């Protein structure tokens, strides 16, 4: 779930509050449309599509679904003890979080005017 | 059907685009949090609860479900040929568009810092 997903982000991006990724570019946080503005915003796009692929499974809601994961040292791991849905949602978050650690953060791309920037 | 919801907003508030609602307050756009900040925003929050309810229906994907309705001279009507899911979702969007056309649009509430406004 989200509390799990954001706990992941805290794991690989300790020097930044998750709120920083709640309204970034055209795809981070919000619903998403238009063209990404940077690698980070692109990360979020992939996370969006990942979740939409996780809905293809009966009664599978990424946002509300709970899974089992571990954040040790800076490593994320989704435990084998996961059914199909959880296993996929977790993997989605894991990849998203890791993508957040490498992508550079640009402040000019935070809380931007969507109507003018995304389309 | 996120698209049909856009047509509805236009069918009631021709003077604006959904973009004006894509990033407004704490709840319009997508993920909500904090205090509604506004009647208009309150509309969006209610719109979320509505989807959360509609999502209890088996395999109902509010965002992608294509429902049946018609917009005639400002009037929104969800038609009967819809099934449980389509019917529920159509009604949500339908009530949001009305709630929209009824609430005042505060430009100061467009693009705010969720970090320092929606805690
Ligand atoms: Zn914004």
UniProtKB/Swiss-Prot annotation, chain A:
Cystine crosslinks: 11-71, 26-118, 28-44, 43-99, 50-92, 60-85, 78-90
Note on how the cofactor is bound: Binds 1 Ca(2+) ion.
Pfam family name, one: Phospholip_A2_1
Location in the cell: Secreted
UniProt main location, coarse: secreted
Entry's EC annotation: 3.1.1.4
Active-site residues, Swiss-Prot/TrEMBL: 47, 93
UniProt note on tissues of expression: Expressed by the venom gland.
Top EC group: hydrolase
Keywords linked to the UniProt accession: Calcium, Disulfide bond, Hydrolase, Lipid degradation, Lipid metabolism, Metal-binding, Secreted
Organism domain of life: Eukaryota
Binding site for Ca(2+): 27, 29, 31, 48
GO biological process, one term: arachidonate secretion
Co-factor requirement: Ca(2+)
Single annotated GO MF: phospholipid binding
GO terms for cellular component: extracellular region
Catalytic activity entry: a 1,2-diacyl-sn-glycero-3-phosphocholine + H2O = a 1-acyl-sn-glycero-3-phosphocholine + a fatty acid + H(+)
PANTHER family: PHOSPHOLIPASE A2 (PTHR11716:SF100), PHOSPHOLIPASE A2 FAMILY MEMBER (PTHR11716)
Membership in a protein family: Belongs to the phospholipase A2 family. Group I subfamily. D49 sub-subfamily.
Role of this protein: PLA2 catalyzes the calcium-dependent hydrolysis of the 2-acyl groups in 3-sn-phosphoglycerides.
The protein's assembly and partners: Heterodimer formed between two homologous isoforms: isoform 1 and isoform 2.
Protein name as it appears in the record: Basic phospholipase A2 1
Species: Naja sagittifera (Andaman cobra)
Curated annotation (Swiss-Prot), chain B:
Coiled-coil stretches noted in the UniProt entry, renumbered to this chain: none
Predominant localisation class: secreted
Tissue specificity note: Expressed by the venom gland.
Subcellular location, record wording: Secreted
GO aspect biological process, one term: positive regulation of fibroblast proliferation
Family designation: Belongs to the phospholipase A2 family. Group I subfamily. D49 sub-subfamily.
This protein's name: Acidic phospholipase A2 2
Lineage: Eukaryota, Metazoa, Chordata, Craniata, Vertebrata
């Amino acid at each position: 779930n989200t509390y799990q997903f954001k706990n992941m982000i805290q794991c690989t991006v300790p020097k930044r509050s998750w709120w920083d990724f709640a309204d970034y570019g055209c795809y981070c946080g919000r619903g998403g449309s238009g063209t990404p503005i940077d690698d980070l915003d692109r990360c979020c796009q992939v996370h969006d599509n990942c979740y939409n692929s996780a809905r293809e499974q009966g009664g599978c809601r990424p946002k509300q679904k709970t899974y089992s994961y571990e954040c040790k040292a800076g490593t994320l791991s989704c435990s084998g003890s996961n059914n199909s849905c959880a296993a996929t949602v977790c993997d989605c978050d894991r990849l998203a979080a890791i993508c957040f650690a490498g992508a550079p953060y640009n402040d000019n791309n935070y809380n931007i005017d969507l109507k003018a920037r995304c389309q | 059907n996120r698209w049909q919801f856009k047509n509805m907003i236009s069918c009631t508030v021709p003077s604006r685009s959904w973009w004006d609602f894509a990033d407004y307050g704490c709840y319009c756009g997508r993920g909500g949090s904090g205090t509604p900040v506004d009647d208009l925003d309150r509309c969006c929050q209610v719109h979320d609860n509505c989807y959360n309810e509609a999502e209890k229906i088996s395999g109902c994907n509010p965002r992608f479900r294509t429902y049946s309705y018609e917009c005639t001279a400002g009037t929104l009507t969800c038609t009967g040929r819809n099934n449980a899911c389509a019917a529920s979702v159509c009604d949500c969007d339908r009530l949001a568009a009305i709630c929209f056309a009824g609430a005042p649009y505060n430009d100061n509430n467009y693009n705010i810092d969720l970090q320092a406004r929606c805690n």
